[PDB]
């Protein structure tokens, strides 16, 4: 009776009448003749945002099936109600729902040429590749207009221009997970990420990287986003690309690494950064020229070499590569520190899991390392070794005269750190070597007071 009154109000968008008529008892009522549709089904299909809002507040089922297997989202998609589509997606209707023929809402909008619905669905993770019972995908049944969207090639000039002009909202208007690694038709044949990286669109890069942009995508001449960023000296975006797995020695068709690009254009600070991420300045290109060759400044030539040995040593030290350490060894490089962490090669050696780490520590000290060098939070190598219970190297550090009671940022000794981690044999040895237990930290704790029962046992014999 009065169910028919509601379903008619839902088509017209008479919000007042839907308010009056609808309640929990009938909000999900099926039209028992014809399509077997819900009130939400009708409202959604007719583009009634306000009726849809109120229906959803009254507990309208967004996964309700009609007789054909459709979902209110199917209905809104067929008739291009991108406002109502966005609203149903937000309540959790999945954009890859299957009707009885396995048409998804993306089939329904691609068939009907609905571009705004297509992009909204793809942004919410719709699948172009789901096939119906006749084996046909959304792209196969697509309208000639909507076919351009489902190949990731739509307003692609406008998408690319937004990326290089730094236009956040006009990018996110067009950006599907498909048009994110598109290439330009001509010129350099760059991707969105290439351009954003080249033109220093730090925010556009974050959005592209989030939405699946390819950090490895090559342009016409072999380059990758990192080449563009380094050439023009964008530290912000260079660091961001590296963070997301960019290959630091990636090579184009002429075998230029990013460090070649940076060094030739005297980007002192990007070179510094790249070297710390494992860049190799001795790598030659097609024209037999290294990064050191292409550096114009004589300061950059020596700094590229100094910083390279430095890192190359630190790395050898941490994978305890004893042979590698014996090679890369002058006094200038021994005490080389890591720009950020302030970690000398000795800190890296005593923290190595690898089996030759005692011998690397020994050699580095024989070759004249600073046994009490502090790292960024004032920890000596003894602290680093002691908090890991790398006890073998503590013999070596002690022999070369490490201060056992060197204090860190919080006034804690090595013993405090060991006691805290529960390292029982470390504690024992640290005392044998001479760590005073009675030292109070800046917070009022002895090593004993930080440790478990077993640690206290050991430390209360003094």
């Amino acid at each position: 009776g009065a169910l028919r009154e509601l379903l008619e109000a839902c088509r017209n968008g008479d919000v007042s009448r839907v308010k009056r008529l609808v309640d929990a008892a009938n909000v999900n009522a099926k039209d028992m003749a014809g399509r077997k549709s819900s009130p939400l089904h009708f409202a959604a299909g007719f583009g009634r945002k306000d009726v849809v809002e109120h229906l959803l507040q009254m507990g309208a089922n967004v996964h309700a099936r009609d007789d054909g297997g459709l979902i209110p989202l199917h209905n809104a998609c067929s008739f291009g109600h991108a406002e109502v589509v966005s609203l149903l997606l937000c309540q959790g209707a999945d954009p890859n729902a299957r009707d009885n023929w396995n048409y998804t809402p993306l089939h329904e909008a691609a068939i009907k040429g609905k571009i705004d619905v297509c992009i909204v669905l793809l942004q919410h993770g719709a699948d172009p590749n789901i096939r119906n019972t006749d084996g046909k995908s959304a792209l196969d049944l697509a309208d000639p207009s909507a076919k351009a969207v489902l190949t990731g090639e739509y307003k692609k000039d406008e998408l690319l221009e937004a990326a290089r002009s730094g236009n956040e909202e006009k990018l996110m208007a067009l950006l599907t997970p498909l048009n994110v690694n598109c290439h330009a038709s001509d010129g350099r044949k760059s991707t969105p990420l290439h351009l954003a990286a080249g033109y220093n669109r730090v925010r556009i890069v974050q959005l592209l990287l989030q939405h699946g942009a390819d950090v490895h995508a090559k342009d016409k001449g072999g380059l990758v986003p990192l080449h563009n960023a380094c050439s023009y000296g964008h530290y912000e975006v260079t660091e961001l690309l590296l963070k997301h797995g960019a290959c630091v020695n990636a090579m184009d068709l002429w075998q230029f690494t990013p460090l070649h690009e940076a060094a030739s254009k005297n980007r002192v600070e990007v070179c510094s950064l790249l070297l710390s991420h494992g860049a190799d300045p001795t790598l030659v290109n097609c024209h037999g020229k290294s990064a050191v060759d292409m550096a114009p400044t004589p300061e950059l030539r020596e700094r590229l070499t100094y910083e390279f040995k430095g890192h190359s040593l630190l790395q050898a030290a941490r994978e305890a590569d004893l042979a590698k350490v014996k090679k890369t060894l002058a006094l200038e490089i021994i005490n080389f520190k890591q720009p950020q962490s302030h970690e000398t090669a000795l800190h890296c050696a005593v923290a190595s899991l690898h089996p030759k780490r005692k011998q690397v520590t020994e050699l580095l000290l024989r070759k004249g390392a600073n046994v009490n060098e502090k790292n960024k939070d004032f920890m000596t190598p003894l602290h680093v070794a002691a908090e890991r219970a790398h006890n073998d190297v503590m013999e070596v550090l002690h022999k070369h005269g490490a201060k056992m009671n060197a204090l860190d940022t919080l006034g804690q000794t090595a013993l405090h750190r060991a006691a805290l981690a529960g390292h029982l044999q470390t504690c024992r040895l640290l005392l044998s070597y001479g760590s005073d237990p009675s030292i109070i930290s800046l917070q009022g704790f002895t090593a004993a007071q930080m440790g478990n029962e077993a640690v206290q046992q050991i430390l209360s014999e003094s």
Binding site: G187, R188, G198, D219, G221, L223, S231, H234
Partner: peptide
């Protein structure tokens, strides 16, 4: 093709 400067700019 033949080698370019890459896409992007300084300022």
């Amino acid at each position: 093709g033949y080698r370019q400067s890459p896409d992007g700019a300084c300022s």
